[PDB]
Amino acid sequence: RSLIVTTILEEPYVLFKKSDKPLYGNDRFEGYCIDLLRELSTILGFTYEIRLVEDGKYGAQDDVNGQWNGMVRELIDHKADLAVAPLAITYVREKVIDFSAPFMTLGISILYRKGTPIDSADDLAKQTKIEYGAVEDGATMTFFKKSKISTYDKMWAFMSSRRQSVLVKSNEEGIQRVLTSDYAFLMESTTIEFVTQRNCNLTQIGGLIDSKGYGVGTPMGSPYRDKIGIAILQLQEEGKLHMMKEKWWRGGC
Amino acid sequence: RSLIVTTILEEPYVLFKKSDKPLYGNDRFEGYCIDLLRELSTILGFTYEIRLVEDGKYGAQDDVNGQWNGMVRELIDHKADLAVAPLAITYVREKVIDFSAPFMTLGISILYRKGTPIDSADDLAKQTKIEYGAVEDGATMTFFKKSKISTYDKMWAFMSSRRQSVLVKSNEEGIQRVLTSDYAFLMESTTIEFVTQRNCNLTQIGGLIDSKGYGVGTPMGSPYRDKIGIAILQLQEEGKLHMMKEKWWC
Ligand SMILES: N[C@@H](CCC(=O)O)C(=O)O
Ligand SMILES: N[C@@H](CCC(=O)O)C(=O)O
Ligand code: NA
Ligand code: NA
């Protein structure tokens, strides 16, 4: 039986292939996560169908009913067998689904314009002129929402007080927001690493605010958690994941 | 019921506490992994007995008979509930035991003296005057043993042909070897970082050769795997793992 694989458009992990003729099914997709999915498919010997998360979200829990959305929700309701995307491994998520060994390490950080006085999250926290934000219902926003670290708690007070105006629908909207206003975008380090390559005016501010990994998501108790985990450790050890990142992290500047 | 926790002596993760008054049981130990163990115990609400792995090994598989040793063996045989140690998460171990989410990330690198022209693994591989080696029956040795990569295959040929002379029983023995002879030691970058803080004549050569994490080990299928994973992710996210590292790490 073919596995249902939920994912989400996000350069350069997952993106539509550009071509003159219409592409169909799995052929439509390409990127780091796609190559990874291919590798896993070969190593473990399964067939699959790629489906984009219906609500177009990563995954967050509503604090009124306690229900999840996005890919996480899709996994909880067994609507998909795997989630192969830049899906962050967090404690709130690991509580409701199972992750594989991480295939990539990263960390929350800041995207801003070059040559400013701003140098750390602390600098943004103790001022209100420069607005800052994050992707809504993402792991970053949740990090700030759950944080008890003074600075980050402050920053979350700001963000929540300004939800409609500072929380964006996607990394792309956040980036453009940085490019079109006095705005600092809290986002994941790897994606910043890719983004600054196509914008000479953009840069990462400070260091990593935390340390996490991307993992393949599976429903809780799934037998694919360990299989896929092993496969990922193998790929990492023989240097294939590194090669894949080399391949997909290039895009003038 | 109390859990049995296997571990291994290794500064600064686990060491015997210095004291004038004789210490007993868990009181005997301190280090990064002991603090970690304490946090897991607080969060998950278990008690425990720390026991050093009897054979003093991390865990590798015997080529001939296929038997495992060390902490990995202790977990396989259900002689321990957890392994809390600087135990590298690897593909081959993951096939026989389970690991929590990593509490620390690292990679294999090179410990050597300062001031030489040696700048990489490749530099070591293409010569023989400077001997080099690794801990026997550990993740690094196994990495070299399994690698299809030319340079690393060549280094494995070198190490294996001189196994008796260049492989060591412990990190400390490899460090002493670096300190007392023309020898380069292949070891994990976190511990290198700890060492080059106490020996100002030593340094890491080159970057990371691979990437891996240390995880808490459990037997395959253990229900504790997930609970510990969640606790580790919690600790990471609140900044505690970082504080522990700052605490325990010229
Ligand atoms: N990769 C994130 C989404 C983007 C972000 O949170 O910055 C997640 O898994 O939720
Ligand atoms: N930390 C290693 C032992 C030391 C080494 O191999 O460098 C292990 O888990 O086996
Ligand atoms: Na889980
Ligand atoms: Na396993």
Author numbering:
A (entry chain B): 431 to 544, 555, 566, 667 to 801, 803 to 804
B (entry chain A): 431 to 544, 555, 566, 667 to 799, 804
Task: Recite the paper's sentences.
The second mutant incorporates a further mutation, T779G, which in isolation selectively slows desensitization of responses to KA. When combined with K531A, this mutation causes further attenuation of desensitization in responses to both Glu and KA. In the GluK2 K531A and K531A-T779G LBD structures, in contrast, opposing R775 side chains adopt an anti-parallel interaction across the dimer twofold, whereas D776 forms an inter-protomer contact with the neighbouring sodium ion. The D776–sodium contact maintains this geometry, although with a slightly longer contact distance of 2.6–2.8 Å in K531A:Glu and 2.9–3.3 Å in K531A-T779G:Glu and :KA (unrestrained during refinement). Anomalous difference-Fourier electron density maps showed no peaks consistent with chloride binding for either K531A:Glu or K531A-T779G:Glu (data not shown). In both cases, significant anomalous difference peaks were visible for sulphur atoms in the vicinity of the dimer interface, but not in the solvent-filled void between residues 531 and 775. Similarly, in the K531A-T779G:Glu and :KA complexes, the interface was rotated by 7.1° and 6.6° relative to the GluK2 WT equivalents. The shifts in K531A and K531A-T779G were such that residues at the top of the dimer were brought closer together, and those at the base left further apart. This movement was larger in the double mutant, suggesting that truncation of T779 to glycine allows closer approach of the protomers at the top of the interface. For K531A-T779G, in contrast, there was little difference (less than 2°) between the interface orientation of the Glu and KA complexes. Density for the main chain was continuous, with the exception of some residues within loops 1 and 2 in K531A:KA, K531A-T779G:Glu and K531A-T779G:KA.
